[PDB]
Amino acid sequence: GDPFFVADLGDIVRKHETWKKCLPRVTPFYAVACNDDWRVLGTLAALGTGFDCASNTEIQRVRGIGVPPEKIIYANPCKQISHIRYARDSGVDVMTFDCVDELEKVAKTHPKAKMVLRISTLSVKFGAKVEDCRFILEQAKKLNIDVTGVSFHVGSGSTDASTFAQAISDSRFVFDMGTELGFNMHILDIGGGFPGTRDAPLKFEEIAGVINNALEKHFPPDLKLTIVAEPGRYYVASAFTLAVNVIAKKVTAQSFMYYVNDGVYGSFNCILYDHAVVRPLPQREPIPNEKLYPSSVWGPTCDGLDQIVERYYLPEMQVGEWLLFEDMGAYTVVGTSSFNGFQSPTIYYVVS
Amino acid sequence: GDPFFVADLGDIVRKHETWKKCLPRVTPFYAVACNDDWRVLGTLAALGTGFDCASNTEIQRVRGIGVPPEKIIYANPCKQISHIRYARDSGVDVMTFDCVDELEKVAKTHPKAKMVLRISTLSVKFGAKVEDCRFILEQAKKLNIDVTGVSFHVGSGSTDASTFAQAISDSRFVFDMGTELGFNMHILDIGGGFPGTRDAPLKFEEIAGVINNALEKHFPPDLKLTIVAEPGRYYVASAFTLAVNVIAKKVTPAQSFMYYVNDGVYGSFNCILYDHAVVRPLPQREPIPNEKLYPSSVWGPTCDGLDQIVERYYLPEMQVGEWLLFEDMGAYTVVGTSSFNGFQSPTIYYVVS
Incomplete structure (x- = not known):
């Protein structure tokens, strides 16, 4: 034994229906690192989710099941230059960063990548401070980088949903510095950290209501904007x-x-x-x-x-x-x- | 990159030469869980070591390089019954235990195994208290179990070598209870925990000297007696x-x-x-x-x-x-x-x- x-x-199918009900403005890019089983990826892809991939191996696995490369974000801020080469040659163009050193690598290896700036909220590990983001975008402009948006990650179990509101408000400040320097900013990526058991103490439906209210205040609807997330344990x-x-x-x-x-x-x-x-x-x-x-x-x-x-x-x-x-x-x-x-x-x- | x-x-060869000189009475049964690379197992087997294996997969692995099953001890006290059948069908007979419930499965699945009783020193997880060992052995007698020895593990980072002298003295007491009840006790296994960085604070050569002194007092040499250990990080x-x-x-900035x-x-x-x-x-x-x-x-x-x-x-x-x-x-x-x-x-x- x-x-x-x-x-x-079928549990994954019901989570997907509840996501669309509570966050109709947000398209979810499943964090493959959470669980990469082939049936789970194939159910999520049949449902029409995007994928968040963190290495050349995950990118390989989701293409393998048929998923086109435009439904992939390469959401690792600090990538080995040979995995970035692999992303470009598989057609994956949307990646994250959070310092100027990474943009130097991207300029030499993937000059047309659509790059998303991650801000801190989460970690000493990742996330640019809002007060450094002007200097980073000025350097991006010198390296001819196509910056397209802003991302953050609150982290996988908060007692308040108010961290999502403060991150959304900070994201709009950094998004407006982008536009002022001439970038085409059109993506907001609100990351992961939603509870995956319907009996958590801080429920999915209250987090979502807090997020929708901050979105309505700082990112009003517009056909040029797409809102995305990176849920893993939620599904x-x-x-x-x-x-x-x-x-x-x-x-x-x-x-x-x-x-x-x-x-x-x-x-x-x-x-x-x-x-x-x-x-x-x-x-x-x-x-x-x-x-x-x-x-x-x-x-x-x-x-x-x-x-x-x-x-x-x-x-x-x-x-x-x-x-x-x-x-x-x-x-x-x-x-x-x-x-x-x-x-x-x-x-x-x-x-x- | x-x-x-x-x-x-060759660092593995030199570790083996140091072991033979500081613990010439002790045969090493390498703990395969520590590092199971195929070249490290092949080097140790060539040097004459035995193998401590904890699962059916480890036993398969070291037989696959040509090690006979008499150079294997199955040193996992709490074994899945289908892993016990696997060892019996591999020729692997020496195994450890530390409670009476494990002897009930052994008597149904591998009734001729040679069984070594592990005493605590290491863990809440493993090792019988020496105060329960009399009762454990009387039950082993009713289950018709061939108990052949005692083992312990001090654990992989003491700063005092004196735990080995206490363990050895405890081991002798439980060995005498075994002889008294009619078992043929002839193995002592002093377990693992030797440093593997020649410059860890408590040196190999000092632990060895404490062990040799405890052995000379409690376990004097005799052709019926074999002392064995289970080093992992050492090698x-x-x-x-x-x-x-x-x-x-x-x-x-x-x-x-x-x-x-x-x-x-x-x-x-x-x-x-x-x-x-x-x-x-x-x-x-x-x-x-x-x-x-x-x-x-x-x-x-x-x-x-x-x-x-x-x-x-x-x-x-x-x-x-x-x-x-x-x-x-x-x-x-x-x-x-x-x-x-x-x-x-x-x-x-x-x-x-």
Whole structure:
């Protein structure tokens, strides 16, 4: 009994209907790094989404399924010059940047690229400060760069939706400096970070209302403007369910330790890289009266820090039963390794 | 310019010569999880090592290079029952355990296995408390289990070698309980945790001398007795040197630089997060007269804002297209890599010193 995933592609279809309802002005460019499974990319492409690609490999994968290059944005600010050459030769023209050094590379390798300036909000890693953006655009003008718009990324779990309003207002300032220096600014890219479980505390529908009101104030509708986003976990987090076998058991007031055949080097790498919190669900239906015991649950590797859950209340379980983990579609399969020889879970697909 | 490793296989030979001289009673069973490259396994097998394997895939791998199954120990205390059948159908008989529930599966799936009881020292995850070992062995007796020895693991970074003397003295107590109950106890396995950088603070040669003194007292030599260990980072940590290209650079006006390189925490530097590694960037350009140095950070190639390698280090001013080297990158590095964001792991090239 090897661990496996169930991927419900009909869940991705409903997320797409809700996006179009709450953000009808915004075309979504799915962040392929979140989950690059071939059926998930093929469902999203059948639905008419764009793709955000971050490397020569992702660009290769989305063309492979038929997607034309105009439905790709190459949204990595700091690109190896040979991956930029690969983008140009596949026909991908829209890329991001956030400093003058990157524009130097682009001038030598992809002179006609349509370039989008990312502003900070997110990171020390990426994002130009609004007070540096005049100097950057003056240098872009000297390098004959076709700057076409502005982008930002708030980050994947805020308690306020007000960060989106402030980023939109800052984006209009930087957008007007563009126009004043003579660039054709016509793209606003409001990035990613929307919740992918309909039971998050800060709901998708309130974030969207905040965004629509800031858009209406600072970017009124106009046929020369396109608004885009880069959602990843919003489309896929709740579509995948993981099942894992209990392969070993320890008993110690009573306490239990369960060992399962997937862990922090495999699918639960999201615990360390994505700060995920996960909840184990016995696959057996809750049966009357049941006693519940303090339990920890561990991955299969040699590593003492391969631990998935430290204290959760479970019934008493037996070797060979199954534990389920819901909402396991985002940043999970993509960061897996084969540490200690363990293999990653096969994926099986349903259509709701 | 893609990132790449250089692996010096003769550093692996010299580590083995140092091991034989400082621990001549101890046979090494290399921990394959640390670095499973095919040339590193082929070099160690040629030098006469055994193999510690933790999964069916590792066992397949080292048999595939021609290692017989008597030079394998299956040292994973909590095993999937179909991996236990796999080992039995491979001829692999020596395995570890640390509770009574694992012996119930063994008696149904591999009833003649030779079983080594692991005691705690290392983890909440693994190792039986020595106060439970009497009861564990009485149950092992009812399950008709051939218990043949004791193992422990101190863990890969003590500053005191005295944990090995306590572990060895605990191991002798549990060995005597085993003899008393009628088991034929003849293996002691002192586990892993030896430094692999000849200049880690607590030196190999000092840990060895503490071990040899504890062994001479509690485990005097005898033709029925074999002592074994399970070293991982010892043999490979300093053999691999990584080279990465600076692919992008930012400058802040105090002058500071940020450099972006084409391998990072989802790749070969996953050791920063899973193995607590601290790494040190070295320009491959030789240190040049008078050099002005600046406070610098160095970042991996992914989208993730937490993919950072170096937070503040003094480097000369670098240019896009130049190379940074990171030494001592052979342990827990290639084996924990993923292809997050599409980036691909570095090719390995080989030199024999």
